[PDB]
Design a protein around this ligand. Sequence first.
Ligand SMILES: Nc1ncnc2c1ncn2[C@@H]1O[C@H](COP(=O)(O)OP(=O)(O)OP(=O)(O)O)[C@@H](O)[C@H]1O
Ligand SMILES: C[C@@H](O)[C@H](N)C(=O)O
Ligand SMILES: [Mg+2]
Length: 489
Amino acid sequence: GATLVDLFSRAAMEMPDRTALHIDDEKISYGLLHSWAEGLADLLHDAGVRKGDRVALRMPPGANAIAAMLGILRAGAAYVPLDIRNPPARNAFIVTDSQVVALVGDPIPEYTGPLVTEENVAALRPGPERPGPQDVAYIIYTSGTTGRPKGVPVRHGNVTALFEACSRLFSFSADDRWLLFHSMAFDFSVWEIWGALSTGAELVVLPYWTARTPVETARVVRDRGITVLNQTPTAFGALTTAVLGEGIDLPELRYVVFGGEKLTPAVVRPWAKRFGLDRPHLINMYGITETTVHATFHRLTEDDLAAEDSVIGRPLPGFTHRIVTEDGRDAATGEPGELWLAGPQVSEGYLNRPELTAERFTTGPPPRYYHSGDLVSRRAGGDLVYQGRADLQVKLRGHRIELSDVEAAVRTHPAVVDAVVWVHEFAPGDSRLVCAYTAPDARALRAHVKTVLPSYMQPSQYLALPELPRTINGKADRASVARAFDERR
Ligand SMILES: Nc1ncnc2c1ncn2[C@@H]1O[C@H](COP(=O)(O)OP(=O)(O)OP(=O)(O)O)[C@@H](O)[C@H]1O
Ligand SMILES: C[C@@H](O)[C@H](N)C(=O)O
Ligand SMILES: [Mg+2]
């Protein structure tokens, strides 16, 4: 149907006996989740929540968080998720920037808006007016690199267009088990949640436990019988180490879907020798929050493991696209350019960032294009290959540097897991190439990199970290690495 509410309604009306949520040994049926959610919506209505309103959600992953989010959607409102490892100042900003009429869960400088507590939500375990396709389902905040975190509001019709685009490339059924691996404040959780709840499938909630190892994660994945696993490449590399080390088998896995980072063939090779490429399928998906979770699809093949190219494949069925030169021109085959995207999954622009919206969402004088700020090429055969972020193609003292190439060159060192390379302003006068990396001292690393890279591309300073700092989506927080570096210097 038109909305996420419709999707849940259909599946719940039609498969009420099936398990919607699985939290350790706890199982909630679609039927009972549906009941709980209708009740929560009525409760939200009573507290003065209206269609088009925005409600904060702040809860650990579990039954209550999910039921609250359905209740919020059923009430015609958008949920604005706050991840609880988010620093208090970040919530405080989002709470005010998004102007929520209420918060669900427990809390922040001002509490003066109304609360629905977790205990309140647990208690409820024709209705308010239903939302339309053009109503906002969620508002997820992305990283603003200097300037503030920015909010992206995604509509019901945006999300429902996502699952329609994917209907024929994936083979999903009510029998699947989806893992909720990701933060509810990361849009990859939307795919995970609604992947399950739109089809009658089961959603396995990874309960919140920070001392859980990859090894434990692997063990749950086998034991809870997961068929659809979503991972960032960073997460999957560590998962693979654990699966291979303990020798875990995963015969029930049907799909592993990658998103959110550049997926290198090297990351995938160890997996592929153990399980092959036929089961599960490996699917790389390029995506951005501004165009609703995923924008492309590429099933991995043996060929992708021969070269070192990052194939992201073709735009999802809903999309039209451009590959654009610095000049505004359409790029030739094999030529790198900026990817632009148009279609029903593209968001309506940022929240309260009117000038940024103006720049990155454009209409000719024609489709409405979102400028991804990502560099890609169309290879012969029509597949997209991902090159890198225009952000990270920088210039320094007369040379152009692919920061991402330096990074990979540092990663080429066998004892190095991860690297972040950037231009650091030591002073206005002194701008130099810097690297942070995780496990080899700087001396050995520096000596190795002098092999791989031209001299202008060699990091001027190396900082060894126990781990790289992480935003809640599990990516390396670049602004956090630069600040840690600066303070250690
Ligand atoms: N399959 C992929 N291969 C390569 N890069 C990817 C892939 N999927 C996502 N990315 C990168 O991740 C980004 C999408 O991230 P998201 O929408 O969460 O915001 P962000 O890039 O983390 O920050 P912002 O929204 O502030 O630009 C894209 O800019 C792209 O560079
Ligand atoms: C799933 C992944 O592509 C997510 N939308 C991100 O933008 O980081
Ligand atoms: Mg981006």
